[PDB]
Structure formats: C-alpha cells, structure tokens
Amino acid sequence: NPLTHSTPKNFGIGQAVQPKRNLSRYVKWPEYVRVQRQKKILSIRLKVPPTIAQFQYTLDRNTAAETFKLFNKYRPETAAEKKERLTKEAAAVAEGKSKQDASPKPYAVKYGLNHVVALIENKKAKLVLIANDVDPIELVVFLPALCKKMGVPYAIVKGKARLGTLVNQKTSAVAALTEVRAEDEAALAKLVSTIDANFADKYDEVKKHWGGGILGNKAQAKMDKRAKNSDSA
C-alpha cells in the first residue's frame, strides 16, 4: 500500500503510446469474408423486386417452433430403421405369403424440391415449408406463387439446415406434409391457420412491395441530418 503508487498514463495524442484496443472493426478480413458481408450489404442496398424479399418475411420464433414440433413427429426413416423394417418385412412376408404388407403405411414429411413441387401441382401437399436461405433463389422463388395458385398453405421458414435436420440431411430447402395422422390433424389445422394468416393471406399485398433500398449506418445518419435540418425548419 505505501510501496505502490497511482501512475496514470496519459493516452492522449502525442503521449504514452496507445494501449492495445479492440480493433475488430478495422480488421482486414479475408477476401471471402469481405465478399460475403458486402454481398449481404448489396442485396439490401439494391431495390429488391417483390418476388424476392417476400422471403424476408419468415415464420416467427413461436410459430416456427410449433411447426417444427409438428413436423418432427413425421421424420422419415433412418438407414437403421429402414434396415430393421426390411428384415421385419422379409422375415414375415416370405414365410407367410404376405403381399409385402408386413409394415404399416408410413407417415413422413415429404422433401426434395422436385417431389414437393409435384405434390403442390397435384394438390397433395397440405403444408409446405420453404427455406428462406436457398443460395440460388430461383429454385424456390416460384414456390410461394405455386402454392398460392394451387391453394396449398406455405410458410417461408428460417433454415435449410433446419429442414435438413428434419429430413436427416444437411440441407433440404423444402419440407412438405401431405398426410398427417388423426391425432395430429387438429394441430395441423391450427398451424395451417396461423401460417396462412402470415403468408397466403398476405401474398396479394407482399407481391406489390419492393424490398431493399436500405442505406448504411453512415448514409442513414446523413439522411437523418439533412431531413432534420433542411426539411424540419
């Protein structure tokens, strides 16, 4: 206590060479980092046509949790489950002359882009989930309009990764329900009501609103300054 002294450092200009500070704002990031950040920036600096930027509207957290809770009861088979079903089916039908019906009718989520598109075109799908982050977006930009034309409820939801976890894949880009068991039909109806409230009922309106046109932080500050001064006088 009497041996130690307060010796404050003057970190002003021209004194006491600066301490190490958090320079993460000024890091010269790799080219790929810079390119992905600036691609995200450009995608909203440009005016986004209404066919795109309807994907900027996603299922909220609660509705998405409920939807995935329903869809998780209809996971497709795993390789192990399919193997066990194959043994249980062969070791029954071969011995008992059964017509390969040693297994019940399956109830799984339908996935795969072409498959789900064809189910929508056949009005078989009762609920379509469309990932909001499909990197070539042309694969799914027509999906909201296809679902609206065929009267199939659809929700634009966050995560092709999440849909992939639904269907035991890395990414799935879609997830469809065509038939749901009787015990889950009521939950399906409630989910379809909530989803239709946000996507299919709002389609005719979100089809006429452009996205993007959003300034950066500094440009927004400058616009606010000139609007505060030159406009509010």
Partner 1 sequence: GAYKYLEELQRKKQSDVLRFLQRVRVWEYRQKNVIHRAARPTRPDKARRLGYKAKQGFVIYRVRVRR
Partner 2 sequence: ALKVRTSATFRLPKTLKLARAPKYASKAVPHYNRLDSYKVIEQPITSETAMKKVEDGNILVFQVSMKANKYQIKKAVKELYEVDVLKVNTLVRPNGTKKAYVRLTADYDALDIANRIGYI
Partner 3 sequence: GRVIRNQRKGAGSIFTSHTRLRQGAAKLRTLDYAERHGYIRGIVKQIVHDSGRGAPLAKVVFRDPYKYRLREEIFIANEGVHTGQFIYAGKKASLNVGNVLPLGSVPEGTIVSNVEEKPGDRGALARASGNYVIIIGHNPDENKTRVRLPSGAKKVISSDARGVIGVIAGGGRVDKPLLKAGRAFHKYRLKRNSWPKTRGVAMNPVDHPHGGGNHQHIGKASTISRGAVSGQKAGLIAARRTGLLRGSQKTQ
Partner RNA sequence: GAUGGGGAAGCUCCGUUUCAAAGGCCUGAUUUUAUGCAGGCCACCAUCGAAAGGGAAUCCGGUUAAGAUUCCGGAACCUGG
Partner RNA sequence: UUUACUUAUUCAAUGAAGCGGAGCUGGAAUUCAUUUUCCACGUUCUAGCAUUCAAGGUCCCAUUCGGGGCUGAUCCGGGUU
DSSP secondary structure letter of residue 1:
-
The reply to whether 222 sits near RNA by the rule CB under 7 A is: yes
Within 28-67, which residues bind RNA (CB under 7 A)? 28-32, 34, 37-38, 41-42, 45-46
Span from 8-16, 22-30, 47-55, 191-199 in contact with partner 2 (CB under 8 A): 22-30
DSSP-derived letter for residue 54 is: S
Q: Which stretch binds partner 1 (CB under 8 A): 83-91, 99-107, 110-118, 193-201?
A: 110-118
Residue 230 interacting with RNA (CB under 7 A): no
- 45 phi and psi, to 5 degrees? -70, -35
Q: Is position 38 an interface residue for partner 3 (rule: CB under 8 A)? A: no
Of 110, 169, 177, 162, the C-alpha closest to 132 is 162
Assess 27 for contact with partner 3 (CB under 8 A).
no
Stretch that binds partner 1, among 64-72, 112-120, 122-130, 159-167 (CB under 8 A): 112-120
Closer to RNA by Cβ: residue 2 or 136: 2
- CB-CB contact of 199 with 156 (8 Å): yes
Q: Are 30 and 187 in contact (CB under 8 A)?
A: no
Give the one residue of 4, 7, 15, 24 binding partner 2; rule: CB under 8 A.
24
Calpha distance 183→67 (Å, rounded)? 15
Point out which residues pair with 176 in neighbouring strands: 110, 128
